[PDB]
Write a protein that binds this ligand. Structure first.
Ligand SMILES: N#Cc1cc(-c2cccc([C@@H]3CNCCO3)c2)ccc1N
Lengths: 352, 18
């Protein structure tokens, strides 16, 4: 066989220890999921510094806590705009997930609160900015560098899926790099508690699994497809399926054909063919052996999963350290934060 | 080349969700 007695016993023990960790982590998650934290700071505790990102319903700003001097990233959502754009459930769900999860590669919600006009989520500030910018600048990551990031996503999805959470938003734009070179996942606006199947068309074209495109009910295996897309794009510098228009992207995704750069190792191509598998009965992460088919793949043979979790592996890349430096985020026009004398949409946001 | 095709796609910047 592939393993002698010592190696097989070690692997079996490791896999049983994962089950034990996940059972405890579920218990902790469910307590916070059923009794969420609310109203843990207020706006005048913070000085606003600068905008790190903007969207249709709000913005993320660097702020400084006046007493500690600590910097945070504050997501500000205009209650009236959230209602108008039909994002009440997504907004409440994102905050409920963030306050309940706990994992070293998931961003931490330090405070949350609301006022007459806005909802506020105060999260850790992650000064390395988005993986996206680093990837486009460097061009592509070497296989060991891509693997270091991929291993963190594998463990994060193993954790989230144990909680029956599907993520549905994986892409370099949604992965931040911290000062130690490790990944932080921040956006939970498309995540959903799903024990079985779900049906919403959501995600980003390049990262959509075929079953989403084909308007099927789908499950957590869409996240493993997305992992394949991410690994490919990290190692190649471009994603496996692209075109001028989304419809042409979708034709490629559903086709069952993927092509690889000549510098990809055979081990990498084998992993990617098993992740980017259209046939759900064959896709890694969706078989009887679950996440272990991925973690035990030859491409990950050098990965010490516990050392990654414990953050004891030396990262391949440390973003330039300039603690409130914003250099790894884009520049945006600074608009004011207005708070009305009258409470807006109170009933809709009671749970926030 | 594939890289040139990627540039030609116009989808090298940050991608929006559907
Ligand atoms: N630090 C930090 C931090 C930054 C963001 C953030 C920064 C830029 C853009 C975005 C959003 C959502 N993903 C990409 C699309 O626009 C989020 C979110 C949480 C954070 N804790």
């Amino acid at each position: 066989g592939h393993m002698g007695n010592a190696a097989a016993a070690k692997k079996g023990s490791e896999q049983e220890s994962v089950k034990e960790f996940l059972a405890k982590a579920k218990e902790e998650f469910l307590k916070k999921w059923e009794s969420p934290s609310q109203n843990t700071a207020q706006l005048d505790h913070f000085d606003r510094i600068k905008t790190l990102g903007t969207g249709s319903f709000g913005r993320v700003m660097l702020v400084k806590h006046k007493e500690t001097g600590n910097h945070y990233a504050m997501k500000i959502l205009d209650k009236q705009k959230v209602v108008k754009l039909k994002q009440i459930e997504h907004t409440l769900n994102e905050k409920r997930i963030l306050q309940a999860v706990n994992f070293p590669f998931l961003v931490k919600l330090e405070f949350s609160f609301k006022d007459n006009s806005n909802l506020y989520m105060v999260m850790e500030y992650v000064p390395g900015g988005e993986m996206f910018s680093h990837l486009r600048r460097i061009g592509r990551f070497s296989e060991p560098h891509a693997r270091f990031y991929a291993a963190q996503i594998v463990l994060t999805f193993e954790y989230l899926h144990s909680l029956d959470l599907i993520y549905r938003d994986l892409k370099p734009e949604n992965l931040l790099i911290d000062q130690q070179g490790y990944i932080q996942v921040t956006d939970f606006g498309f995540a959903k508690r799903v024990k079985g199947r779900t049906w919403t068309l959501c995600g980003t074209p390049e990262y959509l699994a075929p079953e989403i495109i084909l308007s099927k009910g789908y499950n957590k295996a869409v996240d493993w497809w997305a992992l394949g897309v991410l690994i490919y794009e990290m190692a190649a510098g471009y994603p496996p399926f692209f075109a001028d228009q989304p419809i042409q992207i979708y034709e490629k995704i559903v086709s069952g054909k993927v092509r690889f750069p000549s510098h990809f190792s055979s081990d990498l191509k084998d992993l990617l063919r098993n992740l980017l598998q259209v046939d759900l009965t064959k896709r890694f992460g969706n078989l009887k052996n679950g996440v272990n088919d991925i973690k035990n793949h030859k491409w990950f043979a050098t990965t010490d999963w516990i050392a990654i979790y414990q953050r004891k592996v030396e990262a391949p890349f440390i973003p330039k350290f300039k603690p409130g430096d914003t250099s790894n985020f884009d520049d945006y026009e600074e608009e004011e934060i207005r708070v009305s004398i009258n409470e807006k949409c109170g009933k809709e946001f009671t749970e926030f | 080349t594939t890289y040139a095709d990627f540039i030609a796609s116009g989808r090298t910047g940050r991608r929006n969700a559907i």
